[PDB]
Design a protein around this ligand. Structure first.
Ligand SMILES: Cc1c(COc2ccc3nc(CN)c(NCCc4ccccc4)n3c2)cccc1-c1ccccc1
Lengths: 123, 126
């Protein structure tokens, strides 16, 4: 019954701050890397790929360059936590974490961005 | 690697007919049923969950009630085919087929629904 769970399926973040979004997956033992596949995505844009126990960014969408990282240490605890720094309005939307570690599952997370008079994104 | 391929990323179906949408996954030699996990989704609504070699429709969205089935016989050829019966105008949209079988991957498929006026006018009015 391998299940990905999320403590929060909604995050409300203030423009310019850092954000950390969590997916949990069952991990009893010392973790078997390169048996673990973590894919994070927002709308249809890859943010993070983690396969063969190594970060893959060669598919990462232009936007998330230099602002997205997976907290690789939390993986051992069954926590695929995605940290986005310097949150933009374009970061508002639906995120998906897809995790394969024996079984496979996903959860969606909605991110909402509060912002000061952001004429800038309008255009 | 592990890649899901889709021979068609666009289907044009007539309202009321049946539809069969394919997602191909590499299967070298005999298939390992316990390793396979297939999720069919449209928008953010689950259509088919397939784990432990058996269809799980416990999370199946109300719209697809009694019209969604995964053709289990084509699974041996590396074909995760979703069949939708009595196609509706609400079935138009982007489908996703997420497959785990060693590696993992997904592909998107766009479904367009052609309909005569009467069917369209009902869906419109409600
Ligand atoms: C589906 C899934 C994943 C998916 O991880 C990956 C791994 C490699 C990879 N390469 C690519 C690039 N081609 C993508 N996505 C690109 C999408 C795309 C589609 C159409 C055209 C263009 C691009 N990838 C996604 C990871 C973990 C658990 C699962 C899972 C499986 C079944 C049930 C539940 C969960």
């Amino acid at each position: 019954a391998f299940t990905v769970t999320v403590p929060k399926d909604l995050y409300v973040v203030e423009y310019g701050s850092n954000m950390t979004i969590e997916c949990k997956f069952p991990v009893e033992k010392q973790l078997d890397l390169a048996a673990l596949i973590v894919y994070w995505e927002m709308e249809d844009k890859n943010i993070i790929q983690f396969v063969h126990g190594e970060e893959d960014l060669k598919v990462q969408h232009s936007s998330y360059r230099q602002r997205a990282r997976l907290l690789k240490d939390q993986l051992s605890l069954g926590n695929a936590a995605l940290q986005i720094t310097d949150v933009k309005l374009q970061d508002a939307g639906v995120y998906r974490c897809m995790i394969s570690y024996g079984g496979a599952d996903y959860k969606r997370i909605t991110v909402k961005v509060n912002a000061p008079y952001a004429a800038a994104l309008e255009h």
